[PDB]
């Protein structure tokens, strides 16, 4: 498994079903890799897993991948090992990783059943990008016979908002794709703004697609309560303080131009959504130091 089988398997895991977060694919590929052990020594195993995470982030530096792989390493070796033989231990590790991936598969539906009690009747949801989490929570809100409309912003670099508008009018919900610049205009008629994080640092903010900071600060200007959905494999360990404090290994993702992902402080966010529950962005700090152990 000299890391070309790794990346080709990751791309296979991508194109088989593009919808899912890159990170659950990362954890699945790391687990399959772990099965392709060729050696039972705890130390060279975790060193191999760290090299694997590194060669993973070398193609999909979305904060998802690193966060998830590190959480994977955190949760594999939780209980004791007593590796008197080191092979039954690897059995235990595959078992524990499988349990972890089950929790990751339950993340989405837990979000759906905890959140849609918050979209009151006759509102106008606003989002920003193809947050499959926001798509499924919106589905589990409409299919509960709630009533609302929805606006979405095209998010210029890759017009993800348009793709979500397609896959949302495919759900028969009144949807309008407004220009990404117009987040200020609409910010007054849209009651609450839901958006899906792709990284949740210790303070409580998020690290989401480029058009988020302006949206958070506008929806704090005109006092429209903010909500960000963020599953439990995107609890990063960073701590930016400004825009220049998100490392280049997270911003550009490419390898007089444009960034891709950026910060939003935990004052411009009202309530965060995890499968740990509903949290106020300080709970991010507490439950994150408790989740990473």
């Amino acid at each position: 498994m000299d890391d070309k089988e790794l990346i080709e398997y990751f791309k296979s895991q991508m194109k088989e079903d593009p919808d899912m977060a890159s990170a659950v694919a990362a954890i699945r590929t790391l687990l399959e890799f772990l099965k392709r052990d060729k050696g039972e020594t705890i130390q060279g195993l975790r060193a191999n897993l760290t090299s694997a995470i590194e060669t993973l982030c070398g193609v999909d530096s979305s904060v998802a991948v690193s966060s998830g792989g590190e959480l994977f390493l955190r949760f594999i070796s939780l209980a004791s090992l007593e590796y008197s033989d080191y092979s039954k231990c690897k059995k235990i590790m595959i078992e524990r990783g499988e349990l972890f991936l089950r929790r990751i598969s339950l993340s989405r539906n837990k979000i759906a059943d905890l959140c849609h009690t918050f979209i009151k009747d006759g509102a106008t949801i606003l989002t920003h990008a193809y947050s499959r989490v926001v798509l499924r929570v919106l589905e589990a809100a409409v299919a509960a016979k709630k009533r609302f409309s929805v606006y979405v912003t095209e998010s210029q670099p890759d017009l993800s908002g348009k793709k979500m508008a397609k896959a949302l009018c495919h759900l028969n919900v009144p949807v309008t794709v407004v220009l990404d610049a117009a987040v200020g205009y609409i910010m007054e008629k849209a009651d609450l703004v839901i958006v899906g994080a792709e990284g949740v640092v210790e303070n409580g903010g998020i690290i989401n697609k480029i058009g988020t900071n302006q949206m958070a600060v506008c929806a704090k200007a005109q006092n429209k309560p903010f909500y960000v959905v963020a599953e439990s494999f995107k609890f990063v360990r960073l701590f930016p303080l400004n825009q220049q404090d998100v490392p280049d290994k997270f911003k550009y993702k490419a390898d007089e131009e444009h960034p891709w992902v950026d910060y939003t402080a935990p004052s411009l966010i009202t309530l965060l959504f995890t499968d740990l529950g509903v949290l106020t962005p300080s709970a991010v700090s507490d439950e994150l130091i408790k989740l990473y152990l």
Binding site: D121, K145, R147, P174
Partner: protein
């Protein structure tokens, strides 16, 4: 302190809900998707009544088979209904002759017509009335219950106002009178002869029938067959005040509601009223009758919503829409 009986008629003898009454009696009409009998029974339960001798004279089978789906039928709740179906009695005079014949009530029975909507906590007025009794040798008889309103509230279908001269110091009644057409208002000076200290006429009052009573009310009715309504009882008692006068007593409370849907118009009023929380506790989503067919979820402008509504795209519910 003896228990608190409360007789309760279950259909108005002058039937006004024609033709609709022929299907089901008024006391089975859906006021706000609830039977008026449930409103009045919840009321008697709120006041503190142990027994509701529900008397029936029409469609009494339907009433029985519906009231056996109550919360008062089962001995869980304290207010233990005791249905009585008949056809021999034809008026409330006849109802109270029926009572004195069956010798049911000890005292203080809250004579209450079928479809009274209210939340009154009579215990204050009731305490004052029992005081009048215990102090002055059970002369006081029917301490009624009236509620202030202005004469133009939509809860006043002109066919149902009142004019009442009361001795405001002991708050007793001196002259009752309907006004369903009398553009004038007559008054015998004897009331002032009786009021040697200052009478007070009132017209803002609105009736609720919640009148307290006595064994003496039955002992009276059993003498005079000619009675046909508690109002004629009032008048008869108000003309023959020579011996053991038995002066009626008015008593009014302000913060609470009260009515009796006795036509289509006053029904429209009390319905669009109870929708607007005007009678709390007895609201429409508190589901005081805990039947799962009538759960509801409040919203802006009281637009309620029960289970499985599925409003279509564009139905602008404005207000009060159960």
């Amino acid at each position: 302190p003896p228990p608190l009986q409360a007789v309760l008629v279950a259909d108005s003898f002058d039937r006004r809900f024609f033709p609709i009454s022929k299907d089901q009696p008024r006391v089975l009409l859906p006021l706000a998707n609830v039977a008026l009998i449930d409103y009045t029974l919840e009321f008697l339960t709120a006041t503190g009544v142990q027994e509701t001798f529900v008397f029936c004279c029409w469609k009494a089978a339907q009433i029985k088979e519906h009231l056996l789906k109550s919360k008062w039928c089962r001995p869980t709740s304290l207010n233990v209904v005791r249905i009585i179906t008949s056809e021999l009695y034809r008026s409330l005079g006849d109802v109270l002759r029926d009572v004195d014949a069956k010798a049911l009530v000890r005292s203080d029975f809250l004579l209450v017509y079928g479809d009274v909507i209210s939340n009154i906590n009579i215990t204050r007025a009731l305490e004052e009335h029992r005081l009048r009794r215990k102090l002055e040798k059970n002369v006081s008889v029917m301490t009624m219950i009236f509620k202030e309103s202005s004469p133009s509230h939509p809860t006043r279908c002109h066919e149902d106002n009142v004019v009442v001269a009361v001795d405001s110091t002991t708050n007793r009644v001196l002259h009752f009178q309907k006004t369903q057409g009398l553009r004038r208002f007559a008054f015998p000076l004897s009331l002032f002869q009786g009021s040697s200290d200052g009478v007070e006429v009132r017209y803002d009052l609105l009736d609720c029938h919640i009148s307290i009573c006595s064994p003496q009310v039955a002992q009276l009715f059993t003498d005079n067959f000619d009675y046909q309504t508690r109002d004629d009882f009032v008048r008869g008692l108000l003309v023959n005040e020579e011996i053991l006068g038995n002066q009626i007593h008015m008593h009014v409370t302000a913060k609470e509601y009260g009515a009796r849907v006795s036509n289509l118009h006053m029904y429209s009023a009390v319905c669009a009223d109870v929708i607007r929380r005007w009678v709390y506790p007895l609201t429409p989503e508190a589901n005081f009758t805990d039947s799962t067919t009538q759960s509801c979820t409040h919203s802006r402008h009281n637009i309620y919503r029960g289970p499985e509504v599925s409003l279509g795209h564009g139905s602008i519910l404005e207000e009060n829409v159960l």
